[PDB]
Symmetry: D2
Subunit: 280 residues, 4 copies
């Protein structure tokens, strides 16, 4: 009207400046997720399972996801070792309607969702793209890595808007900032940069209620990278300052930092747990 300031990025923020949130006084009590539901996508893999366990260790009602590797002993293992409500859902991230059904079924069994981690995807292991004459492997990467992240984010955002709070954590890769040297995977790099910039784009629109960030890792030692020839894996160590492959336990710290109240001002950022690979 008159005398108030209106934002240039998102006009729905209201009369600026927006009131700052109330934060604890002890630093260690900021990272606690007590009384929060954390739906982690692809929580039946290498990085997803570690993040789900780390969120459960912080007292969170984690929701497990799987597609073809049934994970119901994983959900039960978190409901008896830490006493946090958990469940396992079978969803095809590439199916627009299945994602909606699987997320509306999580806001009902848990009451609400306060933390989301879009951490599902597949890798391109077909060599240079100029050798494949069928647009079926490219279409698959863009369907699970990029389109799936949008399907998950478009539905979870609706839950955050009504609640007015939330935190989305897209799991891109260093392929969204560099090009993998030994292997030639252009479709994979293209999809991960798309997710990395989509996380930033949603931050401006979700600023009023939620937050969006990225946890782009490096060459973590999961079931994804444990197929490459030792000759290929030898060129990864030679180009990593730390000179090794990160473990799944070296990522939980970054994932729990962007989901808790500790990162109450980090919006649309990119935490690069790469071991220094993107620096050279």
């Amino acid at each position: 009207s008159m005398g108030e300031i209106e934002s240039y990025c998102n006009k729905e923020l209201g009369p600026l400046p927006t009131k700052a949130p109330t934060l604890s006084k002890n630093v260690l009590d900021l990272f606690s997720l007590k009384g929060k539901v954390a739906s982690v996508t692809g929580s039946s893999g290498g990085i997803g399972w570690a993040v789900a366990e780390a969120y459960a260790q912080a007292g969170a009602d984690v929701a497990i996801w799987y597609n073809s590797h049934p994970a119901d002993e994983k959900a039960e293992h978190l409901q008896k070792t830490y006493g946090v409500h958990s469940k396992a859902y079978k969803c095809n991230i590439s199916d627009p309607k299945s994602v909606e059904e699987t997320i509306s079924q999580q806001e009902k069994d848990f009451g609400t969702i306060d933390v989301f981690v879009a951490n599902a995807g597949v890798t391109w292991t077909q060599g240079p793209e100029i050798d494949v004459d069928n647009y079926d492997s490219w279409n698959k990467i863009i369907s699970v890595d990029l389109n799936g992240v949008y399907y998950c984010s478009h539905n979870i955002g609706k839950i955050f808007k009504k609640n007015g709070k939330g935190s989305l954590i897209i799991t891109s890769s260093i392929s969204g900032k560099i090009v993998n040297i030994p292997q030639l995977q252009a479709p994979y790099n293209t999809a991960k940069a798309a997710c990395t910039h989509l996380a930033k784009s949603l931050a401006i629109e979700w600023a009023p209620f939620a937050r969006v960030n990225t946890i782009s890792p490096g060459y973590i030692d999961t079931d994804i990278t444990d197929f490459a020839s030792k000759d290929m894996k030898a060129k990864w160590w030679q180009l990593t300052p730390l000179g090794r492959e990160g473990l799944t336990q070296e990522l939980v710290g970054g994932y729990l930092y962007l989901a808790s109240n500790a990162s109450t001002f980090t919006t649309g950022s990119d935490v690069v747990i790469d071991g220094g690979y993107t620096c050279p």
Copy 2:
């Protein structure tokens, strides 16, 4: 075998170092495109038409592209004002098979293609993405902006490999590096950031024969941006160091520099003709 060096990025480069190309002595003679065919995608718009004319002015057999705005007087205008062979093709960039037909029909009427400019796309003008409940506008952006660029690049590369020379120029946007402040277009930013990294990824694989670059512009004064409300267009000038909107004649210099022999060492780069918008 022994004594020779093999590249870490692309093993097909051969025994390193690769021999440097032969370049003219006069700088002004490096920018000439005499005896070269330059197929410019979407050459019936604002930026495509200017680039096609600029390539024709440099003595190049430019090929015009259009989808729904017939451009045959444009192709004829370039065949009588500069004396360079030209033609117009109707292709749906979002159709995987139509692109193949339209590119194989250009390698036959011109003999070869030496310069390609994937410069076709559509903008997202639906406001914040959390308000559209149908994945039909998102699917369209990812089909014309991202998938179209891959269809154009996957076919043109097959022509460069046989010839051993070429230059691809993907026309991404500053949306691949920033988020447009006043308007909220997440699907558009995601698609352009995808192309900006696909160009880099293809540079590693096309290193042996061709080169790939990006001409990410700012807020150029074309038919794309001549619909936004003056209130929206007023926030673009306020956040641009140069404090105005660039013209289509201020982009041809960057397009002719990455297509000619002047940029014989610029591979996988990103020339940002934005007026300084990404700096603030």
Copy 3:
């Protein structure tokens, strides 16, 4: 010799792959700094004091630094509220010899240093640089913001190498990635980008023993930004997705995450706690 791999970045890493560190199983126990000394530079200001308190809250022997605002009641307040050994040192960060004396006097009163935070600097508040005709304000910024960070890093590194472990945290600013729009501070932006890239450069060299990272913040509400006119401060909110100014308690989470064992794989990264300012 033969059969072992030697790194391309730093040849002192040894025969790759380097053995991964031993990490706790509970995520919340990774962030604990028990039995660690954390020397925080400029710990008598706005961000330095908060980081020192947060490190003390995590059970660390924090060392306070000051130049002209005596901080000895701050050091005592941390030695009686948390029971962690602490002390205050008066050092001129711009004096090469004083830094050496003040760091050597900290490795003696504490036994060792396990965490360092180069978080001292001054701001450029003289308007556009083309109006000052004396190279005395530019020389001051490059002496405290950039040269001081090198003096601190060149001496602290000599302690990490002997111990074989450590973590350096340079506090750059978003000015190392963008240009502050309303105010015109070129010397300040130049110095902060220098620190931001120096942190990355030292990561490759300190890879064998220590780690180096950056905590580039946004427009935090400290004594540095509480002088700008409300007209200037009104343009900061309008260009921040979160639409406000961050608090000093919203930065401790990032500082404690890059100093503890949680970030045991984050080397040469850049955690941007800006509220989304660098996104648009």
Copy 4:
């Protein structure tokens, strides 16, 4: 007053939008530098001499610079092979007063300066920085590479402001975006990132009259890189997608593009002629 728009970046732009410049119709006539003076710093080396010759070939009154390698046959060679007024000046770029004397002596013998290229610097060839115990090699790099660029760009700006037109081209390196893998040069990388971000920072302040850009090259084949051991030079080819070292004739195209009217909208950008080194 009322109805006009005032910029957020630089309030001296005037009532927005700023009128666009008048540009030729033929693309090849945009790159011509006829009737322009182009003072190229460090024009007695590898890249400086090539840029000076390329500017002279485009019809420009180039001014040669040297410190310890007298270059007066180079200036005379450009005044008899192309018929363009030229002269040679001996200046110590690290001396604040000498730069002022050498630039005021160039605005007098040529009438004005329309193009400046701050392209003087030295490289760090002392190995890892943790082995040198004297802050004299670090102080030299920050004096010639960073401070020298500010001295050159602080006096030239005063000439552009009175004329209202100009173009500054700082010659940073890929070291301002990456860390050189085989060699360990932290002081050099720190100084080049400083120059790269200073070019962007000056773009916002010089928007009203002049333009500032960067020509960050890769591993060009000049006298600077023709000392490294073939073992070191072998790791440069292996990590360069193009798999070779660029020549000084592959940079002139980029330097003439950012100095002429072709890049009349490229302000505060960064043209990376690296051969694809920064992509991996």
